[model samples]
Target: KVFGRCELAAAMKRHGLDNYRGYSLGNWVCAAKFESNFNTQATNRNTDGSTDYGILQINSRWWCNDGRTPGSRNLCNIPCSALLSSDITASVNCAKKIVSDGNGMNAWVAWRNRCKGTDVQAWIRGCRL
Candidate 1:
């Protein structure tokens, strides 16, 4: 039940958030379980600048167009299906291109660095990321 309902699981099989190049699905899910408990609607009320959502905590406010408020469920226009497919990747890829010039592992690397004390970070820093 935990894995099934977790946002990380949704990202892997559905949201297209997971890239096997960075953190393995198992490790991502473990981090998601620790961070947001896999909740798609999760938010950290204590965060002063981050408005993360779902299992992977994608900072939906930045990506969402509807609104950045914590309660705004309609923040992002990128459909879950589209995110899971190629649109979000294209955008992320473009952003990465400008920075690392098409770095394939920036997103995952940043994610791992932010939450550095986890198995996912270990894999990202030493292996794929």
Candidate 2:
């Protein structure tokens, strides 16, 4: 149960982004599927061969300290907490910040229609995933 729809609605009230709470489930599902296949324990490698971790695929350097474990942008420097959070509201909030520009929903849909043709940068424009 990824937020159960209703919980997400309430949480959205708290977060001041109701639009996102509505669209989050499907978009998030797509993000998980595209990024790490929903492994939840997924990790990505940066161009410089550094690590980005967890569901939202946050950059370690952007959020984490050097030589410290990556992915925690705030909240005690815990990546897993950053990802899973206390609930799906937290998860959606994080994704909302990353996707505030375009959110990649339309991009993801277009990419899927293109038969693995997701150029990512073109799709996200400048969101950087």
Candidate 3:
């Protein structure tokens, strides 16, 4: 599914991504803006034999199992294909694991490169949250 900015914001918000693990909802929104542009089926291939999946771009190396990546850990214990579903429960849950107990928001390069030093609040403007 192709989500608009507020659409994604509301979705993630319902899943309680807002201020999750001390990261503002804006931070999540900012990362998703560049990571997948709100597309639930977004997939990115990595040269390291892993792939990033879904709106939050969970990676196969550790987060999900795609049966194609080498040394995939599947810490989330969910198939990578689950990340492609428009429902987003699987991907958002994995993202929670990514931060709540593991790599945290720093795992997303989009957060580091595009959001960290910027006013992420701008990403949430007009969302009516």
Per-candidate TM vs. native? 0.42, 0.45, 0.95
Runs with alpha carbons beyond 4 Å of true place in candidate 2: 1-18, 21-24, 64-81, 84-90, 101-129
lDDT of 2 by residue, 20-88 (tens): 634433344445445545444556666764555554455555443335543434422545335544444
All-Cα superposition RMSD per candidate: 8.1, 9.3, 1.1
- Which of the two, 1 or 3, has more lDDT? 3
Q: Which candidate is the best by lDDT?
A: 3
Q: Whose lDDT is higher: candidate 1's or candidate 2's?
A: 2
Give the runs in model 1 whose Cα sits over 4 Å from its true position: 1-19, 46-50, 69-76, 79-129
For each candidate, the alpha-carbon lDDT, in order, equals 0.41, 0.45, 0.89
Comparing 1 with 3 on TM-score, the higher-scoring candidate is 3
**lDDT (tens digit, per residue) of candidate 3 on 42-102:** 9999989899999989999988889999767999999999999989788888898898766
Clash counts for the predictions, in order = 5, 0, 0
What's the lDDT for residue 11 in model 2?
48
Off by over 4 Å in 3: none
